[PDB]
Q: What sequence folds into this?
């Protein structure tokens, strides 16, 4: 499993703190983790929470990441943005119970967190705890176990509905503001991490044209 | 302002509790509130959290409601479902601060709540408090006030992106499973509340054909 | 009603933020508020969370304050310290529901809050909300209303037990480390606020001897 | 280490749920756990939250338990009661971070939890998580590690102050309402668990006279 971290500009100063805990849990589980920034350093490429959503969609739909951690001050903006694209099921979690329930009941491929609201002394403990419970069990097993059938069914039906409601990502990538798109993929490590791990060549090819 | 309440089957037994607090705040503010159920009574029409999303989309896009309150056990399923349709900006809130921030920073048209996780003694106090802070200030004013400009801008840019990513609701309504759709709008008060308040005649007309 | 605010050294930088919200709610209700510090300024007299407890006990037992707000990083240290003295019933609250329940179920005379754990973006909103619900209703009314009888009874029985378990405050003041005591009452505004409002002349007299 | 669980009458129906998680964590760690009730069965001996405090004090001061878990609807009543006796340092915790911080910063011998407020779907997950973090590290190590010195010092100073403020437990046991005391120790398993593990023969002897 490949896990990506994406921070927007308001919470970029916490990227190191967040990555430290995510990396620790990932290392323990044998996952691969990629820090796509923002990193909290001067004159780096910038992301808004809306661009976090777009980048999340690019990473997940391409196969470059299997799961994305992102967020903002309250976590709600990034959640709203991530869920505005096809192929993204982005939850919200504030505590470790939220994270476990998300993995077992919803079984999505992204999670948005508050990195400022409620984020103070011991917040990195909460992050570690949350990440641990998020990956404690393989996703989609159901909670409680006896309710797995209807929970899995509804997640399946949601997926079927999303196939009808969203336009395909390639068309979206071509029609959105191209400066907005270019900025979203201008991170210092984007090309390195993305193109090495991308499994959708059509998306890779179009993004190459945007960058070259 | 017209506010709609939508509950799915797992939390239907709490509909009266939830509506009581929502109604109280609404009455105080001079809003109109519509309880679309589920109501928690035997042999009533059923909704899953995925159908909550569809119904939310129908009410908001048609103009039948200006704001929707919904949720499920954890609130995440309904949030995911609501945000899978065009014209819906559905947040999550667990506490009153979450609700205030949602109205001021994101300024969406729906909110999904946990009605089971963390929902115990004094949960109706939390609901009242949450609803009060949700409508304490007119939406989109920004928090803090000095950050209103970039917050309003990003919400605007999200809206622009959603115009490209979602297919139009009418096409969705025609292409989704029609039994799934019919059930979603088979509530005892749906026709009464919806058709009296619907401002989009094309949606009304198609839903009439589904029901007749 | 006279309300006192007491901060220890780790959270002294937040005193202004905390007092602003407490003052606002107090002004609205017609209460009197006294900021006993710490204030977060260089070379001011220092307090630990244990001294917060002692100062709380001095203010409440003397009648100089009717209610005390205090806390520390997590709020637990100050709570433990406050409850180690006679005549003090110090609760804990993290959210507005906690505060309402404390006033109605326990009806104590002090509350300890976390000023660092969970204290981030929008924390001053939480403070205002918490203070508003804390003083929304007169204390000891019971929650729910129908359970007022046993709740009031148990609070009464607790008070009876405390009369047996604690030694009287005057003896405590004489036997504790006198440098520890002197420091606790060496705040720039202690004499001004305390002696003007003290109703127990025996405590006033002994503290005068400690200071003179 | 010997861990005791004490529930009062309002939350007695949750004793099995609570004990299940406490037992699991205890078994994993090689601790001994004793369920002192209430158990949630008809015509059992009753405890109020004030009697929870007294029983906690008896178990800890006697050495019958090294740590006590208790609580009530909100957890605040039991906390207030426990901290009204000598030899008891009873914290409050709502989440796993609270529990870790309590063990490392305060290092007390009891914890009071909310078993109703915020206690709903997945509450037993929260309990397990909380208990796991509570005993993850040996108590009193300090958080962060670099602040261990002043944290340990203040806990030590609190202990010194408590030696002056509380009257000795034996005198308390003799002077409190004796029917109140008798009821507190009339649990079906009290004699079995207490007398087998009591290390203070003076307390054992007096309680024998109360019961015989």
A:
């Amino acid at each position: 499993m490949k896990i990506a971290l994406i921070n927007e500009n308001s919470q970029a100063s916490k990227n190191t703190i967040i990555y430290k805990e995510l990396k620790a849990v990932s290392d323990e589980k044998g996952f691969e983790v990629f820090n796509y920034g923002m990193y909290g350093k001067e004159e780096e490429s910038q992301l808004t929470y809306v661009q976090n959503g777009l980048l999340t969609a690019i990473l997940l739909n391409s196969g470059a990441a299997d799961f994305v951690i992102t967020g903002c001050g309250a976590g709600i903006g990034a959640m709203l943005a991530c869920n505005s694209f096809p192929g993204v099921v982005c939850g919200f979690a504030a505590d470790p119970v939220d994270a476990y329930l998300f993995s077992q009941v919803n079984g999505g491929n992204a999670l948005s967190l508050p990195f400022a609201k409620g984020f103070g002394w011991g917040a990195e403990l909460n992050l570690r705890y949350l990440f641990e419970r998020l990956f404690e069990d393989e996703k989609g097993g159901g909670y409680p176990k006896e309710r797995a059938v209807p929970e899995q069914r509804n997640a399946r039906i949601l997926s079927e509905i999303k196939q009808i409601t969203y336009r395909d990502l390639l068309s979206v990538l071509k029609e959105i503001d191209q400066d907005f798109l270019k900025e979203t993929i201008s991170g210092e490590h984007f090309q390195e991490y993305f193109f090495a791990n991308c499994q959708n060549q059509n998306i890779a090819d179009y993004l190459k044209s945007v960058l070259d």
Observations:
- The longest strand of chain C covers residues 67-72.
- The domain at 1-212 of chain C is CATH 3.40.1400.10 (Ribose 5-phosphate Isomerase B; Chain: A,).
- Residues 15 and 125 of chain C are 15 Å apart (CA to CA).
